[PDB]
XYZ file of N, CA and C in Angstrom:
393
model
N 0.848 -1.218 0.000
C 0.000 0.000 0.000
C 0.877 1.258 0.000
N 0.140 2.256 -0.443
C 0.718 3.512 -0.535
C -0.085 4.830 -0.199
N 0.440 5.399 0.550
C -0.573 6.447 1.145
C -0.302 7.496 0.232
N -1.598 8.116 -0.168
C -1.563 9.143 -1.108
C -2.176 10.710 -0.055
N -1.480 11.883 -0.450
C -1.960 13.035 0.533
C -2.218 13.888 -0.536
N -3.507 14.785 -0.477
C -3.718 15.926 -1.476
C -4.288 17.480 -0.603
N -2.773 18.471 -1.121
C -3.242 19.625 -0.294
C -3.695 20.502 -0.996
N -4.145 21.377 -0.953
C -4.932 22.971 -1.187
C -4.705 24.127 -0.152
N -4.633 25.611 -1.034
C -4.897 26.554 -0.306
C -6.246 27.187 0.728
N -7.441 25.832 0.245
C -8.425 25.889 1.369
C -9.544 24.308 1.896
N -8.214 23.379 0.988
C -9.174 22.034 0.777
C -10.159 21.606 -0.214
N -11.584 22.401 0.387
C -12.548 22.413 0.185
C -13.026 22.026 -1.562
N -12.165 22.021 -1.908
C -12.731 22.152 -3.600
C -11.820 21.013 -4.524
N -10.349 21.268 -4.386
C -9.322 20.538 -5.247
C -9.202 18.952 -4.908
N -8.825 19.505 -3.608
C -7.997 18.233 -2.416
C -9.551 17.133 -2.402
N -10.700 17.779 -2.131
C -11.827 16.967 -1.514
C -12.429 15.974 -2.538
N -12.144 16.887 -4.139
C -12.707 16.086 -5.202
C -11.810 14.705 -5.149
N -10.360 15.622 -5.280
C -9.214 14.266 -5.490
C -9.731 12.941 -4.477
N -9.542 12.861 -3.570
C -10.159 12.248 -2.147
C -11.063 11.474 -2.737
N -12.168 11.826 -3.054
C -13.619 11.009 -3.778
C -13.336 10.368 -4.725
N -12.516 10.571 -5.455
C -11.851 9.974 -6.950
C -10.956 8.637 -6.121
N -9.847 9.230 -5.749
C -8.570 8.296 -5.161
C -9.395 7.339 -4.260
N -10.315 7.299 -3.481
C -10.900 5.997 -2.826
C -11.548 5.494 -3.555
N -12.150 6.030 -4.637
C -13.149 5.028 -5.657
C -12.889 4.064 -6.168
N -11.327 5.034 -6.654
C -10.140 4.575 -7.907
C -9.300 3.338 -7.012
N -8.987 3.770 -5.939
C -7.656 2.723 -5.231
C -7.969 2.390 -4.150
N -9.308 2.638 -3.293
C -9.378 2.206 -1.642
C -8.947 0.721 -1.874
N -8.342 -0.191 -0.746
C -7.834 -1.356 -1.132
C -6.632 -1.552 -1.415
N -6.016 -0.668 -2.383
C -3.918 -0.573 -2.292
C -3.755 0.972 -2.178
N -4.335 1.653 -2.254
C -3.964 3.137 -1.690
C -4.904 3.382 -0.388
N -4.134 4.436 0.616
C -5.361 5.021 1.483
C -4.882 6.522 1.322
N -6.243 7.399 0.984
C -6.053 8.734 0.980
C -6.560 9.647 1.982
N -6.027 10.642 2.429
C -6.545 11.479 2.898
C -5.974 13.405 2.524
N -7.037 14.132 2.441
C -7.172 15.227 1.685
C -7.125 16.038 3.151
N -6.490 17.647 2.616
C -5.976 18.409 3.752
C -5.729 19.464 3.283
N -5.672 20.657 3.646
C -5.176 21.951 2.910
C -4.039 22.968 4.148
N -3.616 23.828 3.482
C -2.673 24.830 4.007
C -3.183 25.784 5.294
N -4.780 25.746 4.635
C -5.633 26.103 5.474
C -7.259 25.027 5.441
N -7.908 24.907 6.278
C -9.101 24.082 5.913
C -10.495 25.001 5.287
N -11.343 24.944 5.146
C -12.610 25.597 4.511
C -13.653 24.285 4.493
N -15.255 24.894 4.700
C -16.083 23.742 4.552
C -15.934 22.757 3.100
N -16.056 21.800 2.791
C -16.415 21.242 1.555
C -17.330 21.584 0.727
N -16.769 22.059 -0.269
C -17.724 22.781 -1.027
C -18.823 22.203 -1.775
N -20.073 23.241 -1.889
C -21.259 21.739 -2.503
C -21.405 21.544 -3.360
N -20.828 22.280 -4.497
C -21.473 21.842 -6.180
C -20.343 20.559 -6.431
N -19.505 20.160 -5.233
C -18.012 19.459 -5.541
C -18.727 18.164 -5.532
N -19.913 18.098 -5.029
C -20.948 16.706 -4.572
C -21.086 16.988 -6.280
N -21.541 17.645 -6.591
C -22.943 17.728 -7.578
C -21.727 16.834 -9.166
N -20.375 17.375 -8.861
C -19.732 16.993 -10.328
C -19.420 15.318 -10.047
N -18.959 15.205 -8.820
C -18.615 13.781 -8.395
C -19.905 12.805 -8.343
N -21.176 13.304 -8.555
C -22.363 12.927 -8.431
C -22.265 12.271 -10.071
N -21.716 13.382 -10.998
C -21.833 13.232 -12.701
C -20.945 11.690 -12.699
N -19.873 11.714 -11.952
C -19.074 10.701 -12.219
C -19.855 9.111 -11.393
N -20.609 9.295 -10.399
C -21.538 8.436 -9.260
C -20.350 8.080 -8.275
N -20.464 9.132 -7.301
C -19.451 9.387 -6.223
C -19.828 10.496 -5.894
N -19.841 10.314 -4.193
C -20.496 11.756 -3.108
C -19.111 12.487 -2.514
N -19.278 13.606 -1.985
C -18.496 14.192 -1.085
C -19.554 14.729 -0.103
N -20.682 15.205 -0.200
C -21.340 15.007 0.991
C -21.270 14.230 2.304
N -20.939 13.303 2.244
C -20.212 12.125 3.144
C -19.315 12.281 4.287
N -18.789 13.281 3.717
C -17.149 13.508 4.193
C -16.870 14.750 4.624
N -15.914 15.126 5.609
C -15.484 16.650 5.740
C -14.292 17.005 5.665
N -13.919 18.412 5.723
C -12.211 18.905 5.328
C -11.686 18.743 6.637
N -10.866 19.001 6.583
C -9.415 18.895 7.638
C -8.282 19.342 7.312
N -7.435 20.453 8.208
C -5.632 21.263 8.184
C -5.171 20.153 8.049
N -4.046 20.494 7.638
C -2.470 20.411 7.068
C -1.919 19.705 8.925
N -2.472 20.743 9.541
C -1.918 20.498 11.236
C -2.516 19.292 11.612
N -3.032 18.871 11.130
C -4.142 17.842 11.956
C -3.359 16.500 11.758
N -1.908 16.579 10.985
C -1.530 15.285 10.182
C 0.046 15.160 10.373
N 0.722 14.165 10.192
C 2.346 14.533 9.615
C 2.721 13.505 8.275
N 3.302 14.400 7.725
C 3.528 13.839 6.439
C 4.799 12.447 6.331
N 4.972 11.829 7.242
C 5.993 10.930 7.336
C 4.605 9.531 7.052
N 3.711 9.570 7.386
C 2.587 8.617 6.879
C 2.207 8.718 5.756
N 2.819 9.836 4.875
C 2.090 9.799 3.636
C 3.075 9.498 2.321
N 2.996 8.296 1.053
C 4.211 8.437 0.581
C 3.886 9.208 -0.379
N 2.833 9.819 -0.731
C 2.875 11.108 -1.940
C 2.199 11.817 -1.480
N 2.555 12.960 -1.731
C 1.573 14.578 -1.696
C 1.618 14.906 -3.372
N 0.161 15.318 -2.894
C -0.244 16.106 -4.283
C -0.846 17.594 -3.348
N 0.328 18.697 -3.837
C -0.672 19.976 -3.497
C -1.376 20.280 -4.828
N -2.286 21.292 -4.388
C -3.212 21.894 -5.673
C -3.448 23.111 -4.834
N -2.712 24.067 -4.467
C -2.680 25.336 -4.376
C -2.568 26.109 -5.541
N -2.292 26.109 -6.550
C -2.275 26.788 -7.350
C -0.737 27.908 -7.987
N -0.787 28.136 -8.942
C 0.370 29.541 -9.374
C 1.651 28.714 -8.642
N 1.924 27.747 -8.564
C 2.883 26.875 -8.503
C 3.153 27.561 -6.466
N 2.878 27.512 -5.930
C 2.844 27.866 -4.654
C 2.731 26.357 -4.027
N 3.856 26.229 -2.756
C 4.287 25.183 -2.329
C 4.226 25.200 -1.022
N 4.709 23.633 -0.154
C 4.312 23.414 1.500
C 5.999 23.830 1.935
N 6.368 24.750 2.721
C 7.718 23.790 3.488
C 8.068 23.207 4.311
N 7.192 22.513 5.247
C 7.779 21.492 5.893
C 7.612 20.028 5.008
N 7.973 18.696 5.752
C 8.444 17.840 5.016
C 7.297 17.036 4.107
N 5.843 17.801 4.044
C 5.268 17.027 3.237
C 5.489 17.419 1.853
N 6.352 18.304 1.354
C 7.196 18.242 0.351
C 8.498 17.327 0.033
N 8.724 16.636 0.704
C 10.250 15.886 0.996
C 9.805 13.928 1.245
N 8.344 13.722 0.748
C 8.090 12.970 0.591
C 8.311 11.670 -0.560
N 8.212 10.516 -1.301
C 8.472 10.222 -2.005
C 8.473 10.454 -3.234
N 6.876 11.051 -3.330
C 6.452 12.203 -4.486
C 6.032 12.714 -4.276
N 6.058 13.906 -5.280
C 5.729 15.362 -4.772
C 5.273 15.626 -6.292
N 4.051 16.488 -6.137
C 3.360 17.568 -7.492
C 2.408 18.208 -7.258
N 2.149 19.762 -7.366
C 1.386 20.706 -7.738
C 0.950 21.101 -8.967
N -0.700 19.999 -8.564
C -0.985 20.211 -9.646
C -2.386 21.774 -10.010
N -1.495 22.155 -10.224
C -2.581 23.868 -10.866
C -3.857 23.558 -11.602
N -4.666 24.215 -10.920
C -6.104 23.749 -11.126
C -6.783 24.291 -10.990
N -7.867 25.049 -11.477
C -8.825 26.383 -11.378
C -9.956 26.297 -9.870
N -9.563 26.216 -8.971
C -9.868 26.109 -7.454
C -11.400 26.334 -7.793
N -11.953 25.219 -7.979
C -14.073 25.836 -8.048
C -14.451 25.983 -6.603
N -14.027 26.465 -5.560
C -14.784 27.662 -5.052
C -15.334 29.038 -5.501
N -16.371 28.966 -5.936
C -17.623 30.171 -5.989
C -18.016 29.692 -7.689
N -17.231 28.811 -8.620
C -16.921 28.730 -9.950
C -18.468 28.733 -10.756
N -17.983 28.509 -12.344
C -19.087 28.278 -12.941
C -18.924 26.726 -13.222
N -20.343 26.255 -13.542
C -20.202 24.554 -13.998
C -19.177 24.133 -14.791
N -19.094 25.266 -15.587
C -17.853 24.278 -16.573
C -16.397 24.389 -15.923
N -16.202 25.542 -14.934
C -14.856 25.719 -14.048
C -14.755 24.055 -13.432
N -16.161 23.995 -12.660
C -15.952 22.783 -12.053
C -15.857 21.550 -12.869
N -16.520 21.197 -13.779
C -16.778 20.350 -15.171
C -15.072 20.173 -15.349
N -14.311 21.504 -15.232
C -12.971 20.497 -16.179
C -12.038 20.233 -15.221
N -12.048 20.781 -14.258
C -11.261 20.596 -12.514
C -11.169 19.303 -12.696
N -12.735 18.961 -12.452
C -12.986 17.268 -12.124
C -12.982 16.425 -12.748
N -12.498 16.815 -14.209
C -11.836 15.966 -14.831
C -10.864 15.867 -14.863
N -10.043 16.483 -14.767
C -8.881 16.696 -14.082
C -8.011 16.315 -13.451
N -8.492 16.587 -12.488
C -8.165 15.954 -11.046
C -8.582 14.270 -11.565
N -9.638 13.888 -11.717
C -9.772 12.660 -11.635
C -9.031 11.840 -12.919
N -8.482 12.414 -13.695
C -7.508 11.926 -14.828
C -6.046 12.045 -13.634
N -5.745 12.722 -13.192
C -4.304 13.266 -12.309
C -4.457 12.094 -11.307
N -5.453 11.522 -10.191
C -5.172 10.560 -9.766
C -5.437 9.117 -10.193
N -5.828 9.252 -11.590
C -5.468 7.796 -11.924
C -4.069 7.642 -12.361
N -3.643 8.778 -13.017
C -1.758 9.196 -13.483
C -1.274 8.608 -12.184
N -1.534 9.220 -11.262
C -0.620 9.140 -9.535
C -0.977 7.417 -9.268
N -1.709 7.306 -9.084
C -2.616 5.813 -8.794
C -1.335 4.664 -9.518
N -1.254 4.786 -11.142
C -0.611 4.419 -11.763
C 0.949 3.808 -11.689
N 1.659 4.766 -11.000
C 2.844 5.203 -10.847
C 3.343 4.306 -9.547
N 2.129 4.182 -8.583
C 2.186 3.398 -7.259
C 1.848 2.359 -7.672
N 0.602 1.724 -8.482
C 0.083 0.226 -8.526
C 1.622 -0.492 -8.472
């Protein structure tokens, strides 16, 4: 198994989709858990796209960066955005990528529409790399 970590500048939107994807995709040889720089509620239209794919985030809630240590995790994926990074060691993990991604907090459908494809193409890439 391989622990997969996905951060954000507020969670709620990038990190939470990834999360819904990565347990769909790998619960069983990956375990994920999603976290940001800062936390924010889970955002709701993030249900509504993962709904398109048949997968909830309603389910689930956000959680800090503090709440965790990155020595349990063997990849981080941030998605902060404008290439903006962590410095303590959940950068110094086995893998590391920021992946830039149009953050759908407040967005329009299609902002969220290509995020979540996105993202959910990015952790089957990551998924991949570990199987």
């Amino acid at each position: 198994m391989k622990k997969v970590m996905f951060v954000c500048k507020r969670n709620s939107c990038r990190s939470q989709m990834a999360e819904g994807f990565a347990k769909t995709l790998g619960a069983g040889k990956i375990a994920v858990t999603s976290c940001g720089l800062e936390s924010s509620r889970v955002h709701p239209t993030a249900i509504a796209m993962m709904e398109e794919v048949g997968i909830d985030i309603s389910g689930q809630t956000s959680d800090p960066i503090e709440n965790f240590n990155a020595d349990d995790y063997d990849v981080v994926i941030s998605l902060c955005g404008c290439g903006v990074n962590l410095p303590p060691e959940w950068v110094t993990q086995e893998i590391f990528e920021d992946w830039q991604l149009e953050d759908p907090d407040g967005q329009s459908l299609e902002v969220f529409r290509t995020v979540r494809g996105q993202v959910k193409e990015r952790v089957e890439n990551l998924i991949a790399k570990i199987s």
